[model samples]
Target: EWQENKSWNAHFTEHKSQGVVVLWNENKQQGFTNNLKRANQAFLPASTFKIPNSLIALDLGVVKDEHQVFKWDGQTRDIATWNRDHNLITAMKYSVVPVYQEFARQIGEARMSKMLHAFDYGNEDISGNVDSFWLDGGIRISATEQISFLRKLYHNKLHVSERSQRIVKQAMLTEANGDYIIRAKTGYSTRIEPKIGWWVGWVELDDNVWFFAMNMDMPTSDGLGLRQAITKEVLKQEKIIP
Candidate 1:
């Protein structure tokens, strides 16, 4: 069920003036850059922040494991809603916002801020709690910083302990193809004039490691499709056959 096309390259080039794409391959120790001068600069994180939040919860022992259950109020909510009863793993699978928000609250602003600072996440004035900056203010991170954060997850360099790192990694891993493991999280927010979209993940093809983060902003009506197309393009650029 994998196909290949040049659409990604074309679209990226077409929208080069608007956004950027950054990628790194660990096996080759090679990196690719386009319209992304400094990846460490700040950009709104949106839902992409959930990955780190999840890891923080695990590291803090807020959740026993990925399968630990958390009850939901059974109220229809945002685009990231899920079932009333969801485990951390399932919450991630569905990107449940309220579930994660609850966890964020449990973690508290101070703890969350400490975690972000400990991890050296986000830019100078952008790394803080969801209430102070990340949610109320929104976080800004460059493509370079984004990929580096992802690398921390891949290489276990974050504030988390080694065991916590492994546990989080296991929860994030998804099958991309036969032997390729793809771990990722997507994000979107419409509060801004143009909705934001994102896909940040790494692909493991045998001994090769490909890590990438893509961000796009467009009208809400066309945002999701644009995000999918951008992701499709990244796979195509990598010749991933999916």
Candidate 2:
């Protein structure tokens, strides 16, 4: 069951942004969200689509593995972290758009279309340029959808091969401190009007896993940090983190 966590509203208000969050504990089968209505509203996935994109790329052999090198084209990019060569690990770490765009190009329409449906991803629309669909295309997903997709990925239950799921999950490992592990991805939709930011993933502790998806209106670029800040605060308030 899901419950509205009104207390979390203070976090978004404190950040001076309107946002929503959905956090579900797999073991407990219980959930909390800041705004149930907004949590169900769909929006551009932005970089958060990397999770399934990685799975599909790996499943289709477009990328050999997380270690496979993606050579830099020697062009200067906005984010300095993206100007260098990268593998799935560093690419995912840096949220390299070009690298994933290349992966999408290779994955192509037919296969990408097939995989999107197979994975039951949002709307399953690749009408936008195959290489940039998730960014500004017709593709959109809600925080609730994110948690649902993540729940499946966590258990390797997606239609993709188990190996692909495992590899993508490994690439998502954001932090590990013995006591807890955080596997997540962050996204920002700059091209879309009412620009928004996202931070979606899960936390692992003992035999329990809590999936979370958050997005907030980023009227100013500085508000980008609130995506994770608010999430961490909610997790801590729930005693899911230290």
Candidate 3:
């Protein structure tokens, strides 16, 4: 039944040139395999990693909750300007790097590393502080790993307490239309010579549940060209409105 309904290979060929797209369908007990060649390769996770970071903070009581407010220093930093006041939810929505960086500092590098490793984020060698080069350098994950991590999060298998998982899941689910609910996070890093973009999310359609992660690397000057186009295409294919 599952095999006949999902044409994974066809979908792969159709979007082959658009970078990596990973999907998982839970209802059928079947996972769609495409981009396997490139799927296991590691790439900078950008803001996509923020979700786990935020979750760790909440689980450890590093922050009160998504609504807890943190003050932003006036100094301009990272991809966006720092805001004077921000809550966990708004910081995530805005992808405020400064706020996250500060929060990471409060969480401290040791605890962050412990949480990341506990979550199976990277290989044993992958551990460091927010300021460490690994934050943008060695921080990487394959498509399989990404999907596995997402599944764990969705099913509350990451060892995070149920209360924390519920809060994080609520914040992550941004769009809801009728029977479909989409929870997602987007990431981009131009600080590197070649900019990278990412989108990792999950969707619930009817009786099925699917998780997806996409990543792309473009020349620094490419601006937001591929990011915009690829996201539009992915959503269109997934039948997600906007």
Candidate 4:
């Protein structure tokens, strides 16, 4: 049976953070609203793009390994966590953009083109600019596309090496609260309207896996936490958690 009792949308709607939400399970049960039907409209993947970029860097051997260190460049833009040196895992934890940006430039446009097409990333256009395509107006993907990419990543279905996929998954682990292993990434698109917030990731339970991709008109940093909060509440409402 297709599981019901979805309140992720209603809950966030009341909070003035109306955005599309998509949920999925291994068994094919799913939940989402019409906002997902606006699936044609794509939003910047923002930091979430790191997920695939990490894999691409690893697969291309552009990065030595997850343990390979990226020392702090010392030219601070913002976010204190980003100031220090970081490895793949730490970079993922901190959502350090400069680190990945450096990796992207090193990967270069030719390899990036091959990687995006190989991975089948949204619309697969690396056009806007080399460094800021995904961050700037160059690339965009919908919540549906996010879930699709994630599913492939989770199941080792992407064209990248299995080792690369597993290593990147290792980097994605966000938390381990008792029986659950939450692997997620938060993304922000400040330049765009009605987006600015995204929590794209998955929750792994003992016997099954649950996935979510959500975004909204989070015009400020204050709404960041709501992405994870609302997803958790929806998982709870679906009895996926206690």
- Which RMSD values do the candidates have, in order? 4.7, 0.9, 3.9, 2.1
Q: Model 1 Cα RMSD, Å?
A: 4.7
Give me the candidate number with maximum lDDT: 2
With candidate 3 superimposed using the best TM-score fit, by how many Å does residue 5's alpha carbon deviate from the native?
Answer: 13
| Model 1 spans with C-alpha error above 4 angstroms | 1-9, 13-17, 38-41, 78-83, 124-133, 240-242
The residue-by-residue lDDT of candidate 4 on 186-220, one tens digit each, is 89887655556788888898888888887777777
Any runs in candidate 3 off by more than 4 Å, and if so which? 1-18, 77-81, 124-128, 132-135, 220-242
Steric collisions counted per model: 10, 0, 0, 0
Evaluated against the true structure, the overall lDDT of model 3 is 0.68
**Cα shift from native, residue 184, model 1 (Å):** 0.6
- lDDT per residue for candidate 1 within 1-242, as digits (tens), equals 11223344566566552455667767666667554443344567777777788888888888888778898787866553575689877787777877877878788777887888787777634444554354446567666677788898788888788877777667676555685677877777555444557777787777678787777665554556566566657667668645
Shift in Å, residue 242, candidate 1: 6.1
> Candidate 2 residues 1-242, lDDT tens each?
88997999998888667999889988879988989999998989999999999999998899988889999989998999999999998999999999999999999999999988987888888888999989889988889888889989988899989999999999998999977899999999988776899999999999888899999998778777788889999999999998
Q: Candidates 1 and 4: which is better by lDDT?
A: 4
Lowest-scoring 10 consecutive residues by lDDT in candidate 2? 218-227
Q: Which segments of candidate 2 are over 4 A away from where they belong?
A: none
Instruction: Specify the poorest-scoring 10-residue window by lDDT in model 1.
Output: 1-10
Which window of 10 residues has the lowest lDDT sum in candidate 3? 1-10
Clashing pairs in 3: none
